Amino acid sequence: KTCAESDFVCNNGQCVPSRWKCDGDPDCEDGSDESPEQCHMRTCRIHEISCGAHSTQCIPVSWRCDGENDCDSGEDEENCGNITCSPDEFTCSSGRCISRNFVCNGQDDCSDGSDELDCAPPTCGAHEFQCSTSSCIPISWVCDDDADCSDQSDESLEQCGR
Amino acid sequence: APTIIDLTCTVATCTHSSDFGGVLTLTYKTDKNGDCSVHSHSNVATLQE
């Protein structure tokens, strides 16, 4: 649903009306209409601090560096502590963050095999030929003059060598 | 092997001739694409495939 011309668009895609802009109340989930820079400080309650811009958890400021891991990611023990990662990066068992493109890629980028633990292979059965559109069909359906794959990959000339 | 549930059959035309002269439509519900070994459990009717 596209927001009407009379509605403001939050950064996350949410529609709010134009009267509700920099009026001080945290309307948008990300506080787009009240960007806490010149308008209002929208992110959660006043005496209340977030677990980061990527964690919607709200912990009271008394939980900031209070000696316990109040946040899910340990971001409460930041500055006075350590450890933070990225949404597009994968956290290994040792704590290293590698790019998600390296998860289940067949190489131990995590230095302990964590990115290779519980990886259902992107391929399909050994008795199977994978269509280039990722469809799994058994081998005996290749070069059968019938395009059982969605993109005629089972009948592709390159695979058949015809 | 795919698990097949709620399987029914209908006949479009029949003609008891020497050649293969009856066409059968079979409807079902499944989870994955695969191969099934199809059989008829009588000698009154012989399947082709």
Add this chain to the structure above:
Amino acid sequence: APTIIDLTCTVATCTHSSDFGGVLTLTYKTDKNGDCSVHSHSNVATLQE
């Protein structure tokens, strides 16, 4: 303060020793996360925190 609804108490294990020898679990549903002040309304059992 947070609001707690549908509170249920279960006991994991018990052993009436001089030290604290029972583990309690409370299950609930809340709207916002914060702090509560737990208490026991009897002197039969005394909580630790």
